[model samples]
Target chain A: FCHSSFYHDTDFLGEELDIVAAKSHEACQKLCTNAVRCQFFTYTPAQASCNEGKGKCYLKLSSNGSPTKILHGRGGISGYTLRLCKMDNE
Target chain B: FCHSSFYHDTDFLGEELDIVAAKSHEACQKLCTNAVRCQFFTYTPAQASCNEGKGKCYLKLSSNGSPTKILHGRGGISGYTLRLCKMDNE
Candidate 1:
């Protein structure tokens, strides 16, 4: 479902990490975003398929990480790359 | 001069192009981005400072082209890497 609602969010939402394939973070996005229906993606650097860097990219279609400002309070790879939104560097 | 309000919009705004230094667009940003009060920058590949790839980056704070999109309607290098905002693909 290609929704205009998710139009601006080009970053990984982490809403639901789906295994797309082994590729760079950018490739991960291309794989998912290649489809207008697919809006966001996350590269798997620490998942099972990502063994030795033979990984996968997760895609999402929800308002998951939208309006997100982060660095990982829990600790991990940076998720969303989309800026131009509500951001707080405090 | 560093300002936090300009923190989120890391993308270059064509608002004001200033010849800060003779360096890569990234390096040009470093010159101003290094300052706390300065926010947003645009690398000039067509301006005076930019020569054979060596160039100048224009820094702005007045919200020049903050919420921008697509290739330059005016034509040239893309400005503002910031996303996650009001985007209309129409």
Candidate 2:
């Protein structure tokens, strides 16, 4: 089984693999989970500097052992899909 | 193998179990690693509201699924030891 964790009002800086529109944080999280290479994502739930209107989901991909930084950001939700927990897969 | 990852200029707020003195960030990290209950720690390298003078290591403890928040702060370093990687241990 796979699970995910969310960090509300948080921003995961850098390592943006792609950017796409999403209506809500859950949709953004679902996109990340569906992507084969996506490890985590950040969703901005309003019009802000990171997006033009509505919201945007920033899908992130990282190499093994890569470090991701987090900072305070309102209306932002960052999350990680625990795909790496499958230690027995690889 | 257990390894540590550090976040520079980052503060992990709350869930503080104990507070202690340390000369440097490395010392604080070592203290966290040595503590039986410490999960992660934030080390402020200089005087601020979090400390009086010099520096202090804020040893922190968290439950099995506690959510720790990070904020931007100067002269502070937060880190986590991947002790949770020991999936084989119970």
Candidate 3:
């Protein structure tokens, strides 16, 4: 016989973004919110002009907790809060 | 001893949508492309108005080729293609 625990560790493995646009922080958040699997996002506003695809929002996932760390650079990137889901279920 | 092969079967594990918008199939496809983890998507056009939150695009995933089947109803929904990546590596 095998026994299993209900406690499952939800850890984010890494993600890839397919859409790129020149969008405001709100717009990026909206996009992330609309995505079913989107847990967090990183956007670059200043760097938006360089890449033919500006306003690139990189969506990420992590179940251990908040991102290991946030690297602030030239782009305007923001991440979403999955804590809401945690609280809702709690 | 345990033996494992690199040929791992990729299967779609249901996803949740966080964004809703009245967008064209092209727009939806673009969004999926931008998302790193987005393997495929399903969008509904006709059903865009019925739900208070219209234009819902449900992003999906599947490691074993295309969706098993597509249900055509009253909405204009489309899915993304992950085969491009497969071909790129091939």
Candidate 4:
């Protein structure tokens, strides 16, 4: 629920850095969490024929509010940092 | 409450980055909130005679827990991201 909403490739959290062969959005999410500079990410669901854009985790870092716009033709899922989400039980 | 409790300069949140002429810890907190990569901060409360370290705000990024230990002969206040704190009126 921390994600603003699903958008293709527009509302990037930061630059376009990709992680190849990523399994799911969760994989990308954790990557962003561990990275000191990554604030959000875009996960392209694996497609049988999609090469460069398929199954990749794109880490990003946006300083403002959750994405408010977009600019892309690529088909994928996007999200922001879980910093605003629950991090522990304590 | 997000701060692990003041421990001077030892328990650093991350690298040593300082914002000079800062007024208070709240100012340091906002800097962390706005920066895409900042997750914590260290604010050196201004001292009447302290020259070099006076009125400085240090933004930090910690991927792990608040802090476990520190390493410094200097003194300052420290805290974590408000992302874990209540963010709004909601």
Identify the leading candidate in terms of TM-score: 2
The TM-scores, one per candidate, come to: 0.25, 0.37, 0.28, 0.31
lDDT of 2 by residue, B1-90 (tens): 757766666656433334454455346666544545676665544432122224445554545343444544333465677674242122
Q: How accurate is candidate 2 locally (lDDT)?
A: 0.48
Off by over 4 Å in 3: A1-26, A47-52, A66-69, A72-76, A81-90, B1-90
Q: Which tens-of-lDDT digit does each residue in A1-90 have in candidate 4?
A: 454545554434232222334565345456645654454455545431111233334443444343223424332566555453323111
Instruction: Tell me which of candidates 1 and 3 scores higher on lDDT.
Output: 3
Alpha-carbon error at B49 in model 1, in Å?
A: 6.3
TM-score rank, highest first?
2, 4, 3, 1
Ranking by lDDT: 2, 4, 3, 1
* Runs off by more than 4 Å, candidate 1: A1-90, B1-17, B44-53, B63-71, B78-90
Model 2: residues with Cα > 4 Å off, grouped in runs: A1-90, B22-25, B45-52, B73-75, B82-90
Question: All models: lDDT?
Answer: 0.33, 0.48, 0.34, 0.41
True contacts kept of each: 0.00, 0.00, 0.00, 0.00
Worst 10 residues of 2 chain B by lDDT: B45-54
In angstroms and one decimal each, the interface RMSD of every candidate reads 19.5, 14.8, 15.5, 19.9
Tens-digit lDDT track of model 3 for A1-90: 212111111212132223334355336556544554555444433332111123434444444442133222222234444433332112
Restricted to chain B, the TM-score per model reads 0.39, 0.59, 0.39, 0.47
DockQ, prediction 3 = 0.03
- Candidate 4 lDDT over B5-43, as tens digits, reads 444543343322223246553455665566545544555
